[PDB]
Ligand binder design. Structure first.
Ligand SMILES: Cn1nc(-c2cnc(N)c(-c3cn[nH]c3)n2)nc1C1(c2ccccc2)CC1
Length: 820
């Protein structure tokens, strides 16, 4: 069984477990045993949890960031159901007693022993929250559909839990010997070396002597820094380039190992190719030893010297600026550091930036303040996870302040926290143990941590780190490994089906490709792999029987698949679709959609519901991923074709959109449809302007039958093609209820745009911190400070609320002038 689990982990993570052992790396070996021990303890705690505590793990509550409603309730082993009239203010327990009292009269004879399952979903309704606070009830209330629930007894949940079982003395200046290389280029060869502490240099960069294009240097490179003054997280960086500039390769290493021991002596650096020095770049060598440009260096023996333990470390106008600073101002913050600890604890980041990291006495003074520093709010701690703060004690403190994150906040910031892993110097770190610990305690967290790691396994710079964490997670949850394998087997089938479709679309017509896609899908191996799985887009969503006749593909470049599903146990809530796309990098789309979803959350918290469509987008592999289908939706371009023999047929093109909404929302329903349109139109106008989303045409703008407008295919953001505010006449027309002049409706829309924008301005620092953490991903449109500047300008964060509002009204007016 121990061998079968090992072979299943290897197929799941995409890398054989034997390859980790073939490295013989003591750091990899220590990480593997420690994290396995950590994850098995987590697994042991889980198998003994209470049935309510198991529901919290397995099905964490989906809550929103008086009025009467009908609710259908049945029992597990019964087709019989009772429709009850309840209130939005009523609690699950009250509904459960109604269900048990109705069963008492039917069967002729405790709600504390039950939970409510959402029919055909891995979602439950429980705890002291009124029905309207559950995301599922909210969806039901807005759509006008009846919530369907199942009374699940505590014994049936226990049965699920059960079936799911498993030093200062060295004053000499730091120096290295540069022995030789073994590369390929056209000219002379120079090795530029630098000592860095994050983005900041610990001294000036020291260049090599020019050698003609196996180059041998055998030269001594000396740095303007003493050996005692090197911080624990000191990073030695190298860049190889050609001179007549021409970058070739780059390589980095930590001066201290994973056991705090200063490194000696000879080292071979397997360099990485270039697009001069790259401090943010990984500290592990290129695994392609065959075709990698190498560099041999000698680290002189200063003798065994370790980095001092914390016990040894511990022994050894101010307000007008504190909201980039001058040399005198830095000295002001440094001298008054005890007053920063006492009266301004949230100004920790500015204090860490003014400390001389190249001086061990300033670091020991800094760290002494840190070990007695009060816990910072979650917003402050996210700023400290940035590569601008590379110290291990600073990182350990940042995680300590992030422990108070709820599972919903951590789900919100999960993507950024996974990208911080790419900045880590060692395998065994506090962020990994925190992420692993929160993943093992929350099945939905576990789910997305797996997929964020798995989607990057084709990248060699992270393949070892990500594969080790995933193996660690699998030791902690054998059942979820099996669940995740069913997902990967479906994606393996979708990839092969998409490949046939890509080839077929160029040889024959769509009717013949679709019919031959269906026959391929109808094969037993396909029918088995594509059916009865949890959605990678959302674990609470169950993809039951694949609806072959309803499956197709889209006509865009990559020929993406349209896969439909149906469930008897869920009814109409089980009618779901997934889009499979292979050939495009989906990382940027996922980031864009996460940011919009965050905006929606922030607006909802201030009571502003702009009726957004935050549909799922998940990378799953190399240029592979899934998109959640938003049912009953069509593109503006498709509506605007103004096709004949339709109810949406218009006398003027400007009217097609309104007639379509009129056809989908007859009589009294059109008023709500216009309202949904205006609200969502205000949210997406603010979302695109803030995020610099350009190249917006009728083909990448969609509409739901409800009126809800949404955006698709986000390949560009943060101005990268300054995008102006955009207003379309066709949408102004629907807002103005079709009427030529309707200032009442238009300025009510302008009001919504202003409200949406000022709320996001108040959380502008949260966007700035998350986008800075996102720089670690390596996105081409999120590489430098000029991309981050774009958000400072769009949100006008350097202004007062009054000055920023006049400026937004300037951009909104300029956009109205552009509209015809
Ligand atoms: C009916 N329908 N629905 C959608 C839809 C729904 N939900 C989504 N999330 C997205 C999405 C697209 N990109 N990214 C997300 N597209 N797209 C269609 C169309 C279509 C589908 C299938 C075959 C032909 C044509 C173009 C008309």
């Amino acid at each position: 069984v121990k061998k079968l689990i090992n072979s299943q982990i290897s197929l799941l993570i995409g890398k054989g477990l034997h390859e980790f052992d073939s490295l013989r790396d003591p750091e990899v070996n220590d990480f593997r045993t420690k994290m396995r021990q950590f994850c098995e303890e987590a697994a042991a705690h889980r198998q003994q949890l209470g049935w309510v505590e198991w529901l919290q793990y397995s099905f964490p509550l989906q809550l929103e960031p008086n009025r009467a409603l009908l609710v259908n309730v049945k029992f597990e082993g019964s087709e019989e159901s009772f429709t009850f009239q309840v209130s939005t203010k009523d609690m699950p327990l009250a509904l459960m007693a109604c269900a048990l009292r109705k069963k008492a009269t039917v069967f002729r004879q405790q709600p504390e022993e039950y939970a409510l399952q959402v029919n055909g979903r891995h979602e439950y309704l429980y705890g002291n929250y009124p029905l309207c606070h559950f995301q599922y009830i909210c969806s039901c209330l807005h759509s006008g559909l009846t919530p369907h629930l199942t009374m699940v007894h505590s014994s049936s949940i226990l049965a699920m839990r059960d079936e799911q079982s498993n030093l200062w003395s060295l004053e000499q200046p730091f120096s290295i010997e540069l022995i030789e290389g073994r590369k390929v280029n056209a000219m002379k060869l120079v090795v530029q070396a630098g000592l860095f502490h994050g983005n900041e240099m610990l001294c000036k960069t020291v260049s090599s002597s020019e050698v003609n294009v196996e180059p041998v240097w055998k030269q001594r490179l000396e740095f303007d820094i003493s050996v005692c003054d090197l911080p624990r997280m000191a990073r030695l960086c190298f860049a190889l380039y050609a001179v007549v500039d021409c970058p070739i390769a780059w390589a980095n290493l930590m001066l201290f190992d994973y056991k705090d021991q200063l490194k000696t002596g000879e080292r071979c650096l397997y360099m990485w190719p270039s697009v001069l020095l790259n401090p943010a770049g990984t500290v592990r060598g290129n695994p392609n030893t065959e075709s990698a440009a190498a560099l041999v260096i000698y680290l002189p023996e200063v003798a065994p010297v370790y980095f001092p333990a914390l016990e040894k470390i511990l022994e050894l106008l101010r307000e007008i600026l504190e909201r980039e600073l001058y040399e005198h101002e830095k000295d002001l913050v440094w001298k008054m550091r005890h007053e920063v600890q006492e009266h301004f604890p949230e100004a920790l980041a500015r204090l860490l930036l003014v400390t001389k990291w190249n001086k061990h006495e300033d670091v020991a003074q800094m760290l002494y303040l840190l070990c007695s520093w009060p816990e910072l709010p979650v917003l402050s701690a996210l700023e400290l996870l940035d590569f601008s703060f590379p110290d291990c004690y600073v990182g350990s403190f940042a995680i300590k302040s992030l422990r108070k994150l709820t599972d919903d906040e951590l789900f919100q910031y999960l993507l950024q926290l996974v990208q911080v892993l790419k900045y880590e110097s060692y395998l065994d770190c506090e962020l990994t143990k925190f992420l692993l610990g929160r993943a093992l305690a929350n099945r939905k967290i576990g789910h997305f941590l797996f997929w964020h790691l798995r989607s990057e396994m084709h990248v060699p710079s992270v393949a070892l780190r990500f594969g080790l964490i995933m193996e660690a997670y699998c030791r902690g949850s054998t059942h979820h490994m099996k669940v995740l394998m069913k997902q990967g087997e479906a994606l393996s089938k979708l990839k092969a089906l998409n490949d046939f479709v890509k080839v077929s679309s160029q040889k024959t017509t769509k009717p013949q490709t679709k019919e031959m896609m269906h026959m391929c899908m109808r094969q037993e191996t396909y029918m088995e792999a594509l059916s009865h799985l949890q959605s990678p887009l959302d674990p609470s969503t169950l993809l039951e029987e694949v609806c072959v006749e309803q499956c197709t593909f889209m006509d865009s470049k990559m020929k993406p698949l349209w896969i439909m599903y149906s469930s008897e146990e869920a009814g109409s809530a089980g009618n779901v679709g997934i889009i499979f796309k292979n050939g495009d990098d989906l990382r940027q789309d996922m980031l864009t959609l996460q940011m919009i979803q965050l905006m929606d959350v922030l607006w909802k918290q201030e009571g502003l519901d702009l009726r957004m469509t935050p549909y799922g987008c998940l990378p799953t592999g190399d240029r592979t991923g899934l998109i959640e289908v938003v049912l009953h939706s069509d593109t503006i371009a498709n509506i605007q074709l103004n096709k004949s023999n339709m109810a949406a047929t218009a006398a003027f093109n400007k009217d097609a959109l309104l007639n379509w909404l009129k056809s989908k929302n007859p009589g009294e329903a059109l008023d709500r449809a216009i309202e949904e349109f205006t609200l969502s139109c205000a949210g997406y106008c603010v979302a695109t302007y803030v995020l610099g989303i350009g190249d917006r045409h009728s083909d990448n703008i969609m509409i739901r039958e409800s009126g809800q407008l949404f955006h698709i295919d986000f390949g560009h953001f943060l101005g990268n093609f300054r995008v102006p505010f955009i207003l379309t006449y066709d949408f102004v027309h629907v807002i103005q209820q079709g009427k030529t002049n309707n200032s009442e409706k238009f300025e009510r829309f302008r009001g919504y745009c202003e409200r949406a924008y000022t709320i996001l301005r108040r959380h502008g620092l949260l966007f700035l911190h998350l986008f800075a953490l996102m720089r670690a991903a390596g996105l081409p449109e999120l590489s430098c400070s000029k991309d981050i500047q774009y958000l400072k300008d769009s949100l006008a964060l350097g202004k007062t609320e009054e000055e920023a509002l006049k400026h937004f009204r300037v951009k909104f007016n300029e956009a109205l002038r552009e509209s015809w």
